[PDB]
From a paper:
Type III [name] systems are innate immune systems found in bacteria and archaea, which produce cyclic oligoadenylate (cOA) second messengers in response to viral infections. In these systems, [name] proteins serve as ancillary nucleases that degrade single-stranded RNA (ssRNA) upon activation by cOA. In addition, [name] proteins also possess cOA-degrading activity as an intrinsic off-switch to avoid degradation of host RNA and DNA that would eventually lead to cell dormancy or cell death. The two [name] monomers dimerize in an X-shape, and each monomer contains an N-terminal CARF domain, an intermediate helix-turn-helix (HTH) domain and a C-terminal HEPN domain.
The T59A or S60A single mutation did not have a significant effect, but the T59A/S60A double mutation and [name] single mutation abrogated cA4 cleavage, consistent with their conserved roles in cA4 cleavage. In addition, T81A was about 100-fold weaker, and [name] completely lost its ability to bind cA4, suggesting that these residues mainly contribute to cA4 binding. In contrast, mutation of T59A/S60A or [name] completely eliminated RNA degradation activity. In the previously reported structure of apo-[name], residues N416 and H422 are coordinated by a Ni2+ ion, which may cause a conformational distortion and hence generate an artifact. Coincidentally, in the structure of TtCsm6K137A, which we initially determined to investigate the impact of [name] mutation on the structural integrity of [name] homodimer, no metal ions were detected in the HEPN domain. The Ni-free structure of [name] is essentially identical to that of the Ni-bound one both in the overall structure and in the R-X4-6-H motif. Thus, Ni2+ ion-binding does not significantly change the active site arrangement of HEPN domain. In the apo state, N416 and H422 of monomer-1 form hydrogen bonds with H422’ and N416’ of monomer-2, respectively, and the guanidine group of R415 is buried inside the domain, where it is stabilized by E332.
Residue numbers in the entry:
A (entry chain B): 1 to 18, 20 to 164, 169 to 345, 349 to 464
B (entry chain A): -3 to 464
Write the structure that this text describes.
C-alpha cells in the first residue's frame, strides 16, 4: 500500500509538466486494482458475501473495485444497454465470470423484479447490493429494493464504493461501505414505531419500544410514555392493580417540575379522570360492595369496551364479556333496592307469573332457581318497578329472552353455545343503556373513552 | 411561441447544427437551449405518471443545478428545501433565480447518509399531513439512494410522501446530451407497491406469528391484484386457523373442508399445501369432532372433548403472561371439561350425579378429610364443583387422579374452587398466574391421558407450514 502514496506523488509530478487521465490508467489503475485484488476491506464492519449484485451505468472502474471488495463467487451485473461495452474490461479487471442482466436506464421496476428473483434463489446467504455506478434512478432503486427486502432476507446488505490539485481523490482512500438502512441509523425512530403501535392498541409492544427509547437516548421523557402504555395494557387485560400502580407513578412524574412541559401534561384532565376510574374499580374489586357506583361503572364500561372489540373476530369471547357487564349492571340495579337474594313467596309466585306471560308458558314448569338468572333478575326488577328496565317493550324483551337465558350455557362458562353475534349485540345494547343511567349516578371527570393522544 | 415545445424544438435543431460547426456544447447549451427549456417548465411543468399537488418538496443537490431546477418547477411546491453538499452551496442563488422560489438550504456532507435520514425526519415532523416530494435527481449515488431509502421508510408513517426524479432519455449518439424537451419528472414507486406478489411474504410472516386474520387479508388481497387463485387456497387455510383460535369451530370446519375440496382437484395437485395434506386432514377431522360434540354434548365422543380442551389449553398458554384473567377462564373451562369426561367413564353426569345416600355420605367424608376441618359440615351442591368432581372421582379410584400428590393438591385447592369466583365468570378474583399454571398443569396431565384413549391423527400441535 505504501507503493501507492509514493506512486500518487509521482502521478502528481507527471500531471504537472503535462493527459491527466491516461497517466492514472497507466501508472495508478492496476496499482489500485492490485491492492483490492488481495486485501479488500468492507466498512464499517467487514464480512464476506456469497452473492453480489451490481448496477452498471457509468464506467467499470468503481464497480470493479466493489466486485473485488465484496468477494462473492456469484456476481450479477445489472447494466444499461449503453454500458454493455464495459463488461469485457470489468471481467478482465476483476477476473470473475459475470451473469449480465440488461435493464433500461430507468426501468426501476426491472431492478425490483430482479432482486426479488435473486433473493428467492439465494434466500439464506449474505447478498451484497452495490449501487455505485448507474443513474440516480438505478442506484436509488437497488437501495430501495434491498432495504425493503431486508425485512424478509436479513442477510441482504446495501453497499457502495466511497471516494484538490488533481481533479480526483487520493488513490488509497477508497473504501467499500455498507449503506445503513434508516432503522439502524436513526436513534429516535423507535419513537415512531411505538406511537404507531400505541395507536393500534398494541400497548404491550408500545411500552417495550418506549422503554428501549430510554436506553438509546437517555431521555427520560420516554419513561413516562412507557408507564402510559403499561397502564393501558394492564387495564385492557383487566389487571386493575397494575394499571393503577403505573397510572399513579405516571401522575407522580407529571406533577414534578422537570416534566411541566411533557406533552402528556397537555391532557392531564383526561388522565386524572382515568386513574381515578382505575382507583374506584380496584377498590370495588377488594370490597365487592355494589355501593361503589364508580367502581361498578368503570368495571362494566371496561368489559363493554372489550366486548365491542371482540365482537367481529372473537364472538365467543365477546359474548362472555357482555354477559359479565350486563350481569354487574343488573346487580347494581338490585342494590338500588337494597337487595343484593331473599324472595317472599309473594314475589316468587308473582315473578313466576310475569316470566310465564313473557315466555307464553304456564306458571308451573317455570323453574325459579335459588340464584336468579339474567332473565329472572331482569323481570324481578320490572316487577319491583325499575324505571329504566320497565321502559323496555314486551316485543324487544321477548326478542332478548333466548340470549338472556344463555348466560351460563355460553361456551366459556359452563356450556357449549356458539353465540349469534346478533344475540351478542342484543345483550351489549341492553347493557349499554343501563350503563348510561349508571353514568348519570356517578362523577367521573372529563374521561375520554379511548386512550389519550400522545401529543407528538 | 413563448415557452412552447415548438420554440424549444427549433432551438435544439439550431444547437444541433452549431456543434457540427465546432461550437462548444457547454456554453452553447447554456445560451441556446437552456433558457427555453426552463421557460417550458415555468409554463407547463412536465410531470408523470399522474399529475399531483405537493405542498413541500425536498431536493438533494450535488452537481448540476439545472435538473434540480426542473424538478423544483415540476413538483410545484410552495415550500422548497435543498439538501446540498458544501461544494454546491454556490449554485443556490442561480437555483433561486432559475426557479423563482425562495429555497431553504440545508448543508449535508456528500456521503453523510445519516444526515439525509435525520433531515427528512425533521422535515416530515414539521410537515406531517401534506403531500411531500423527495427529489433524488442530483447528488452522489449515496445521496440519491439515501433520500429514496428515507422516503420509502418514512411512508409507513407519512403516507403522503412521494419519491421523484427527473427522467431524461437520450436520443443522440452525436450530441451526448439528452434531447432538450424529453425530460420528465417521474414518481419512483415503492417496491411494495410495484411488486404484485410480495404480499405473499407479508402473509407468510404474519402467518408464522399467529396473525391468521391479517395473513388471510393479504392472501385474499393478492388474488384480486394478480388473479392467481393459488393464494385463495392459502387464505382459506389462514381463515381456518383464525376461526379455530376464536373457537368458531363450525366456521373453522367450513373453511377446512373447502380447502380439502380444492386440494383434491387436479388443478391443485402440486399446490405446496398438498405436501402436508395428511396433517391438514387430521386437523379438519379434529374440527369435525369438536363440532359434533358441541351439538351432541355427549362425552363419549372423546375426539371432540380432546379437541375442544386442547384448543382451550392452547389459548390459556398464550394468554398466560399478558392476559392472566383470560388465561384463567380458558384453563378452568378446559379442566372442567376433562374432569367431566372422566365421570362419563363411570357413568354419571356432573349436573345430575344421581348420588346414593352412601355415596353422598362417603363423598362428604371424602371431601371432609381433604379440607381437614369441620368434617361433615360443608355441604355438597346440586351440581358438583371442581373439587367435588375431583373427590367423587378420586373416591371411586381414578387412575389419573389417584396418581396425584396430595401436597401438590394441597396447594391447588384454593385455585380449584375459584372456578366461579373468576372475574370473568361470576366473581371478582384477580388471578395469580401461579394458580393458572397449577390448573393448566393439572389439565395438561388429564388431556394427555385422554389423548391416549383417542385415535389421534398426525395433528402437529402447531399450524401447517406454508411450503413456500
Ligand atoms: Ni377501542
Ligand atoms: Ni401457538
Amino acid at each position: 500500500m505504501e507503493d501507492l502514496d509514493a506512486l500518487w506523488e509521482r502521478y502528481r509530478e507527471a500531471v504537472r509538466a503535462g493527459n491527466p487521465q491516461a497517466l492514472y490508467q497507466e501508472m495508478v489503475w492496476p496499482a489500485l486494482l492490485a491492492l483490492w485484488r488481495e486485501k479488500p476491506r468492507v466498512y464499517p464492519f467487514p464480512q464476506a458475501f456469497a452473492v453480489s449484485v451490481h448496477t452498471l451505468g457509468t464506467s467499470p472502474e468503481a464497480t470493479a473495485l466493489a466486485i473485488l471488495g465484496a468477494g462473492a463467487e456469484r456476481v450479477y451485473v445489472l447494466h444499461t444497454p449503453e454500458s454493455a461495452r464495459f463488461l469485457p474490461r470489468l471481467r478482465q479487471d476483476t477476473g470473475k465470470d459475470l451473469y449480465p442482466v440488461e435493464i433500461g436506464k430507468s426501468d426501476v421496476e426491472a431492478i425490483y423484479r430482479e432482486v426479488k428473483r435473486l433473493l428467492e434463489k439465494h434466500p439464506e446467504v449474505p447478498v451484497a447490493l452495490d449501487l455505485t455506478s448507474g443513474t440516480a434512478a438505478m442506484s436509488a432503486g437497488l437501495a430501495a429494493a434491498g432495504f425493503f427486502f431486508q425485512r424478509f432476507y436479513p442477510k441482504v446488505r446495501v453497499v457502495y464504493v466511497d471516494n484538490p490539485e488533481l481533479r480526483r481523490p487520493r488513490a488509497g482512500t477508497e473504501k467499500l461501505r455498507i449503506l445503513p438502512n434508516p432503522h439502524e441509523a436513526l436513534a429516535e425512530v423507535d419513537a415512531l414505531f411505538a406511537k404507531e403501535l400505541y395507536g393500534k392498541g398494541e400497548f404491550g409492544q408500545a411500552a417495550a419500544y418506549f422503554r428501549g427509547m430510554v436506553g438509546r437516548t437517555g431521555n427520560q421523557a420516554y419513561a413516562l410514555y412507557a408507564l402510559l402504555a403499561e397502564m393501558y395494557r394492564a387495564w385492557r387485560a383487566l389487571d386493575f392493580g397494575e394499571a393503577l400502580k403505573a397510572g399513579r407513578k405516571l401522575l407522580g412524574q407529571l406533577s414534578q417540575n422537570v416534566w411541566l412541559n411533557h406533552p402528556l401534561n397537555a391532557r392531564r384532565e383526561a388522565l386524572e379522570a382515568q386513574v381515578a376510574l382505575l382507583e374506584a374499580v380496584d377498590r370495588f374489586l377488594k370490597a365487592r360492595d355494589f355501593a361503589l357506583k364508580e367502581g361498578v361503572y368503570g368495571l362494566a364500561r371496561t368489559l363493554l369496551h372489550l366486548a365491542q372489540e371482540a365482537k367481529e373476530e372473537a364472538a365467543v369471547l365477546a359474548a362472555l364479556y357482555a354477559y359479565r357487564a350486563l350481569e354487574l349492571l343488573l346487580q347494581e340495579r338490585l342494590a338500588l333496592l337494597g337487595r343484593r337474594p331473599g324472595l317472599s313467596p309473594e314475589e316468587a309466585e308473582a315473578l313466576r307469573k310475569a316470566l310465564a306471560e313473557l315466555l307464553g308458558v304456564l306458571p308451573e314448569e317455570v323453574r325459579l332457581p335459588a340464584k336468579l338468572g339474567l332473565l329472572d333478575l331482569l323481570a324481578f326488577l320490572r316487577l319491583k318497578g325499575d324505571e329504566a328496565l320497565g321502559r323496555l317493550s314486551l316485543a324487544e324483551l321477548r326478542g332478548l329472552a333466548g340470549a338472556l337465558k344463555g348466560r351460563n350455557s355460553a361456551l366459556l362458562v359452563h356450556g357449549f353455545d356458539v353465540p349469534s353475534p346478533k344475540a351478542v349485540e342484543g345483550i351489549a345494547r341492553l347493557a349499554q343503556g343501563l350503563l348510561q343511567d349508571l353514568e348519570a349516578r356517578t362523577a367521573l371527570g372529563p374521561l375520554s373513552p379511548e386512550p389519550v393522544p400522545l401529543g407528538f
